[PDB]
Amino acid sequence: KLSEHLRYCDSILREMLSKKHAAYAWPFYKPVDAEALELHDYHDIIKHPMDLSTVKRKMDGREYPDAQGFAADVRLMFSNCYKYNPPDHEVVAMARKLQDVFEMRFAKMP
Ligand SMILES: Cc1sc2c(c1C)C(c1ccc(Cl)cc1)=N[C@@H](CC(=O)OC(C)(C)C)c1[nH]nc(C)[n+]1-2
Incomplete structure (x- = not known):
């Protein structure tokens, strides 16, 4: 069984993959x-390296101890993209749009 906050995290993940x-x-x-x-x-x-499939593998494997651990990997994924790429790269805009979704949903977690 996933933690209660981890169930919400898994829901955020499902949305990000949808x-x-x-x-x-x-x-x-x-x-x-x-x-x-x-x-x-x-x-x-x-x-x-980090990506949504890896976050899924880890979630499915019950590897995250808490929501913070989950969030750290999601942010690592975005940060890797920002780190590697010039800021004007198209993939940076895509990362940012996905991060807007993530940060909003994660912040609204009661
Ligand atoms: C499958 C993947 S993973 C990915 C990319 C693609 C295609 C894209 C990308 C995605 C979408 C659009 Cl429209 C353009 C580029 N960029 C690279 C970096 C790059 O320099 O790649 C080019 C050599 C420019 C292709 C990058 N960095 N971080 C990630 C996650 N990605």
């Missing part, structure tokens, strides 16, 4: 495939 947000969320659905995208320095710059 068709509603797919126009901006899709780059975050799986780990960055550095070689497929020809980002040959990605793993040098980003030492701790």
